[PDB]
Structure formats: structure tokens, C-alpha cells
């Protein structure tokens, strides 16, 4: 129904990503039959029919719907036009590269896990989210009428966040220098800058999305308008007809013929004029048809359990808060994982010094425990002595003692790095900035749609 | 459409077992959700609608349908009467112990496999079967007219099987000293002995089944007829109803239901009427057909059991070939592991003198250690250098030696192999046998 301020995902979308991730259906590995996926998604999680899940998978696999795709589909997923997808038995899919970042650090006991629908598995309430998916991909939902969060540019949302990490009480106008307004994957041209401001602090506003119309003059002293990109959600199926209905049922000037020059390597459309036709005709196509239409914002996401009208300021302020809980947890999990390893490695350094004495001690024993409990002499532990008896002959070679010497150093510096992030939160916030720029530099794509 | 002679299963029934076993949903373990079972069976093996799979899976868990059930269901799947089941949402299931005996030796490269409906995975063409599910559980379908194979007693089928192993040219009469007729999980009594024999040699037979009717003479000379068990495939929902339609439009001389149906100086001719005009006594028709060579074939007792014995030998011959090679690929390793504990210090003090793992394996020209054998030495645990974990390595050498020696004998003589079959079938009989219901 509605997404939450943190990961920006609606319930169904989250189950999809987690399922496909659990089954190891990632970007680097081979595509999987959607029928199997939707079969594991419905069987273990989300039961509300098959045709509710595959519906979501296909939306996430459309670059013309989401700014940065979350699912990658091979087969009929639909075209830039109002074209339909084939059934689940006929397509194969996997996750995108970037989707792996929403799920990155899940194993580290970072996010809260809730109990399954039929109480069998365990599923995440939120995904760790290495990027702010809420502004990046947007949302359309339930709640009164219908919510509308528009998609923004990945790179621009990152900059805004990095600014608000250092400046918590950041004024809305400053943020607008990093994220000036929305960025639609369908392009277009957004107007009303003073109206976008209202959308950013409160959540409502009207903006008007014009199409990037380019005029190129042809033979016989005539002109001819060509639409390079039409607005978001709006299809060129019945809009191409709505423009033809103005000439066939003549309401203006020299509107001659309307021909759709489709999309292959680009969108192309209106051979207007034939000889001396006004461009005041263009204003009729704007005001009457959906060639230009108002996009109303209504930014609502679930906050702390309850739905709440939100703006750019608290969306980002709820994102940074989540990321710190995820990072503080990632670190706490690894500090423990690294201390548990260090101990064993320290004991493994000891058995390398008294090698020949410990060779005879294990040889002159009876069983495994008569080797483990016989390791009273240095003082080893249950897990440390376990680790010595369960060490192989190859680990006692030249290279495997040297690589083991460097693992100790690598481990002690990790614990040292990890203790700083937990101890001082100033440096934790600096890891957040570094990780997000590490994400920006890899997935940044320049903006479409003028302002 | 028709079951397979060898394992007595229809493609859907097989798919259920194979899918459930791979997902570790066996008897010893917990009852896994029915939705997940069907979901995996559909997504990986059978794409012909969910309600066709659950129905098959619900049938193999009803003790009023299959004699020795292959699926075990916790909750509502229907009672002894015509009581309806629940939905896949409200049930949970697993396989029964005896079902595991059909899948016994699956992974041992025993049975032929075939690719998926979408060429994604591998599914078996037949199960390795340790008991003849064709006679033991039967089948009712459509193959011409309708195909019908009745359920029989496990023990009696095994006795007949062991005789057929020892006497290939077995006569139908001698065979009926072991297997005297069908055994329905509903009870009753089967008449027409020579008609059972007609079925066992040809495939078709009209025998007539009758109910178990005992007399209950109550208070003041008044009598009442009590039915203990009604015949097979006959529901008592319509039968108790048609025995009410006879007293309403009185064609004879009350009726209550408790399996127990209870019916002044009325004659014992009502019993004879109710036998001829209702389904309390009906003609059961045999029509034993199954897929042999990839085509339906009308089959008698002898060629059913012949196809079974012929199957069981290839399973065993293939099981033994798998295991002889496994124990050969392991003895070769063990022999090197004893050759090293004799020159203990020389191997420890050579590996330490080496660079890496592979440079230590190449240094094993100290007698001549092979690739797979050298892998085991460098990847050997330090706990395997203690007395008890070296003593067992001498017993292992001996076990592997006696295993190969025992196995090699089974493959080299098609006589001692048959003796292993008889043995195995007798092991199964000893464990799952149950006294027979119904009579002659």
C-alpha cells in the first residue's frame, strides 16, 4: 500500500528483493525462471495471489517507471508505449546491481526481522539501504485519494544527504542547490520553481510537466513539431490519438497530419502547417490535451508505525538515522566476529612457536578430547584448542604461516578501526558520507528533464 | 494417465515423492506446510494447475483409498467415511516411512532421469522401489474403457515375489497359495475364486464384493442388521441414503448410522433384497493395464511381477556398481593414509619444508603418492593423528575391503544377486506387514 521513509519500499517489493536474494538470484549469476521465483515468494511470504507479485516485479524491471531499476528482466516486460508484458511462465529475471546495495549488510544483524505469515521463516521490516530509494525511485499508493512521491536523480539525492549529515538543521532552500527538483526517467520539462519549494517542506504542490518539443522546419515554407519526450505516467498510445482528434474534428488552425515515428533508438512523433500555420496552436495542445499536465505531489510514507505527510527535510532526516543504526550494528557484529577470530589466531601463533612439542603431544594422545583437554600446556580455550586439532597439514607450510602472520595484523587494525566508529559518532557519520559517495561515484547518471 | 508397472505410480504421484524427499520432508522430520510442497512441485516439476496436485497428494494420505499410504497428513484430509478434505492452506504433510522404501537408492545412479518441462532440472522416469506398489496400492483411471487394479496385502505380494525369483515359470494356481486375492482397505468379502484366477492370467475379471454383515437380535424377539464395513470406492453417503429410499417407498418389510450401519417379525429376505438392489453388493471388475516399454499393455500377475523382478535386478546391479567404485575411490586413499602413519615424522617434516599446499603435494614423491591420495594427506585433520582416530582407520580399511569383496560377488553372478533381492524383500516384509482385511 504505502512505503516507509527509510528504505522507500512497499511491503510486496521488500519480500521480492529479500526472496530473490535468499535464493542467490543476483546480478552476476544466471537469470532465473520468474515462475519459480513467484512460486517461492508466494509459498514462503506474500500469499495475496500470484497476479499481485509478478505485477510488482515487472514494474521494478522497467527503466521507464523507476529511475534506477531494482529487478532485471529478459523477455517481454513491456515497452515505452502502453505495451503489456507476457506471463510468468514466459520470462526470466534476476535483481539489478544497485538492488544489491539495498540488501547489502543484511546478514550483519542490522535491521529488525519480523515473523512470517504462516510462522515458518523470518523476514526484514526494512532493508539496510545503501542509497535513499524513497526520493530516488518515488512512490504511488493508497492512504483519502492517492499519494505521489516523484522520482529524483540518484546523484542529486546523495549530495543533499551528505550536506544534511554535517548540517542537521539545514534550511530547505540550501538543500535545493543539491536537489533542485524531480528527475523523471521519461524526461520532459518541469516548471514552477516556487511551487517545488512547497512540496519539499510540507509535501503538496502543482508543477506542470511540459514535453520537450523541438521544432524543425521542412520544405514548402512549412514547419513541423516533434516531441522528443512526453511526461511521466502519460502514455503515447491515446495522447497520439488526442492530438489527432483536434485536427480530424478541427478546433484550431493549420493542424495537418499527426504521425507517430515511434521508438527504437529514440522517441519521435506532428507535421503541422503545410503552409503558414501559427504556433499559438501549440498552446491548445498544451492546455487541452495531456501534452502538458499538472503533477500533484502528496508525499506520504509510513513513520514509526503510523502514516505521515512528509517533506524532503524529514525524509532525509529519517534516512540518516536509519543508516547510523545499520552501521553501528554492522560494526558491533564485526567487532565480535573479529575478536572471536583474533583469539584463535593468537593461539595459532603459539602452536607455531612450540610446533615440534605440540606435534608429539597430539601424537601421544588417545582421542580428540584427550588432545583438547591435554592442551593445558600455554593456556588455550575450548574453541582455541578445538581450532588447533582441527587444523590441516597444509596450514603448516611456509606460505600458510606467513599469510597467517598478516591476518593477525589485518584483524587487530580492523578492531581498532571498528572501535572508533562506535566510540565517537563524529567518525561514524564520516563513514556514512564515504559509503554514499562510494555509491554515487559508481551509480551516478546525469539528469534528464529540464527545470 | 496410466501407472508404471515397475513402481506402480502415475507421473504426478512420482513427482510428489521425489520433490518432497529432496526437500527433506520425510517421516522422521516435522510436518511441512502443504502450500510449500505443492508450490515446489508446480514451480519445478508439474505445471498443470494446483488443484490436480493437491488432490493426488490428498489421495496418498487416505487409508480408505491407498492400502499403504505414501503421504502422511496432519489435520483434515477426510475421515473413513465420505468426509471432505480441507484446503492446502489448512493442512501440513510429509512422507510415510514406507514411501521412503520406494525412493530407496535414488541418488546411487540406479534409475534413469529425464529433463524438466523447461529443461531446468532433472526428474526420475521411475523410482527404485523396494516393494511392488502396483499390486499393493493399485490404481483406478482411464486407459478404450476404464482401467482398474485393486490393492493387495504387502506380505502376500512379497511371498509371491520371492517365489517368482526362485521359479520364473510360475503357474497361477501355485501363486495363489501366497497371493489368494485382493485386499481392500475398506474390508468386506470377495466371492468368485475362479474369477480372481481369470483376472490374474488375462487381466479382466468380474468377482463380486459383499459387505460384512453380522446379526444383532435385540429386545423382545425384534432383529436388527448391523453392517461393519461397506465395499471399496462406494461412499456411504449415498448408500445409507439409498437404503432409506427403500423403506420410504416400502419395497420390503429403521435405519441409523454410527463404520457401523444399523438396520416386528420381518424375514431375513430384506438382506437378500438389499444385496441385489443396492450397492451393498456390487460387481468389481478388474482391468489391469500399465505402461511397459513406453506403451499401455494389458497385464496379468506373472508379467506384472516379471517386470518388477527385472527392474529390481538392474537397480541392485547399478547400486552395487556405484558403491564398488565409491569404496575403491576411498580404499586407495585409506591405504596411503596408513603408509604415512608408518613414516609419521617424514611426512610432517616435508610439508613444513614446503612452500604451499600444491608444492607439498608435488613434494610427495616420498612411496609414490597420487593426485587424489595426496589431497587427502595435506587436507588431513590434526585430530586424526591420535590413537582412537588411527585405530578406526584400520577397521575402515577392513570394512572397505570386505564391502568391495561382498559387492563384487553380487555383480559377477546373477544368482547371489537374486539372493540379495529375496533378502531385501524379506527385510521389508518383516517391517511393514499387516494382517489381511476382507475374505474369500
Author numbering:
A (entry chain B): 29 to 171, 173 to 298, 300 to 407, 409 to 482
B (entry chain A): 29 to 171, 173 to 282, 286 to 290, 296 to 300, 305 to 407, 409 to 482
Extract from the study:
Bacterial genomes usually encode two type IIA enzymes, topo IV and DNA gyrase, each composed of two subunits (ParC and ParE in topo IV, GyrA and GyrB in gyrase) assembled into a functional heterotetramer i.e. C2E2 and A2B2, respectively. Both enzymes act by passing a duplex DNA segment through a transient double-stranded DNA break in another helical region. By contrast, topo IV is a decatenating enzyme that resolves interlinked daughter chromosomes following DNA replication. For example, though gyrase is the universal target of quinolones in gram-negative bacteria, topo IV is the primary (or dual) target of many quinolones in gram-positive pathogens such as Streptococcus pneumoniae, a major cause of pneumonia and other serious infections.
To gain insight into the mechanism of S. pneumoniae topo IV and its interaction with DNA and quinolones, the structure of the ParC55 fragment has been solved and the model was refined to R = 22.30% (R-free = 27.55%) at 2.7 Å resolution using wild-type ParC55 data (twinning fraction = 0.323, twinning operator = (k,-h,l)). ParC55 forms a biological dimer in a ‘closed’ conformation in this crystal form generating a ring-like structure with outer dimensions of 100×100×50 Å and with a central hole approximately 30 Å in diameter, which is wide enough to pass a duplex DNA. Each monomer of ParC55 contains two distinct regions labeled ‘head’ and ‘tail’ and exhibits an overall structural fold similar to the one observed for other topoisomerases. The N-terminal proximal head contains the CAP-like (catabolite gene activator protein) DNA-binding domain and the ‘tower’. The CAP-like domain is composed of a helix-turn-helix structural motif (helices α3 and α4) typical for DNA-binding proteins, with the active site Arg 117 and Tyr 118 on the neighboring ‘100-122’ loop. The residues Ser 79 and Asp 83, which upon mutation give rise to quinolone-resistant pneumococci, are located primarily within the helix α4 in close proximity to the active-site tyrosine and are oriented towards the predicted position of the bound DNA. In the closed conformation, the ParC55 monomers form a tight contact between the α3 helices with a mean center-to-center distance of 10 Å resulting in the protein-protein interface with a buried surface area of 706 Å2. In the ‘closed’ S. pneumoniae ParC structure, the loop is positioned vertically and stands on the side of the DNA-binding groove orienting the active-site tyrosine towards the expected position of the DNA backbone and exposing the active-site helices (α3 and α4) to the predicted protein-DNA interface. S. pneumoniae ParC55 folds into a similar closed conformation to that of E. coli GyrA However, interestingly, the DNA binding site formed by the pneumococcal ParC55 dimer differs markedly in its electrostatic charge distribution from both the E. coli ParC and GyrA dimers.
